[PDB]
């Protein structure tokens, strides 16, 4: 791959993915081991703490990233409050593209679950969320979505023009302008045979927003039933509005 130098800068805070997967798996195993035979977390609670740990890893990614790290804390907060669930969705779909296989979901822990298990055991709301996510993964697999493009999309999600009241809105405009330009340069040089790749990638962004909102809605009802564990980042973001 020829890579725009800007995208090389963006790539510098990417984690070693399989290391992070293993760290999260080890965390969840330690959580369950700290618990007696009878106080073990439920599947749903374990999956919430997995999403929680993923969010920590996302926050560590953003706080250390070029550009983001020059913002004041209160600007950082505003950005992340806007995109946290889009970034968890984006993280998820990219993981399915590069580590996953058709027919199963690849969890951040490295474990795989057949969608047919989920279809037979989950309710309609979760099933519909899984269906929509699958459509998105299908699109991104079809496009041969890669790490260079993924990091551009993360930045375009994070530096959102939807966010009001920023102290440094100019940096958001700069990220939008310069990351779009780098992404187009990248796709045109590396996937010339896909003449519309740039625009097809960009068309996934409102779809990621929609999914993220449906996901928040699902978690919100699960919270209303007391089922979401608390004292964590995940539940705080959900309540921040």
């Amino acid at each position: 791959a020829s890579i725009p130098h800007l995208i090389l800068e963006l790539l510098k805070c990417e984690p070693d993915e399989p290391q992070v997967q293993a760290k999260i798996m080890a965390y969840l195993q330690q959580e369950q081991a700290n618990r007696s035979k009878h106080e073990k977390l439920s599947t749903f609670g374990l999956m919430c703490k997995m999403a929680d740990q993923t969010l920590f890893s996302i926050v560590e990614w953003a706080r250390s990233s070029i550009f983001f790290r020059e913002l004041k804390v209160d600007d950082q907060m505003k950005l992340l409050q806007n995109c946290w669930s889009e970034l968890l969705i984006l993280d998820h779909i990219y993981r399915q593209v590069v580590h996953g296989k058709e027919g199963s979901i690849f969890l951040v822990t490295g474990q795989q679950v057949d969608y047919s298990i989920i279809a037979s055991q989950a309710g309609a709301t979760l099933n519909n969320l899984m269906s929509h996510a699958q459509e998105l993964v299908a699109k991104l697999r079809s496009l041969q979505f890669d790490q260079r493009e993924f990091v551009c999309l993360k930045f375009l999600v994070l530096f959102s023009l939807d966010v009001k009241n920023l102290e440094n809105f100019q940096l958001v405009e700069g990220v939008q302008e310069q990351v779009n330009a780098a992404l187009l340069d990248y796709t045109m040089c590396n996937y010339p045979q896909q003449t519309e790749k740039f625009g097809q990638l960009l068309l996934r962004l409102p779809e990621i927003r929609a999914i993220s909102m449906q996901a928040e809605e699902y978690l919100y009802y699960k919270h209303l039933n007391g089922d979401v564990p608390y004292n964590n980042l995940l539940i705080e973001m959900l309540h921040a509005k």
Binding site: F56, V59, E60, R63, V73, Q76, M77, L80, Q81, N232, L233, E236, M237, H239, A240, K241
Partner: peptide
């Protein structure tokens, strides 16, 4: 308000 600010997020971002 401050009540809805996510405490854990703020703590993470505030760290040097």
């Amino acid at each position: 308000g401050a009540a809805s600010r996510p405490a854990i997020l703020y703590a993470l971002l505030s760290s040097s």
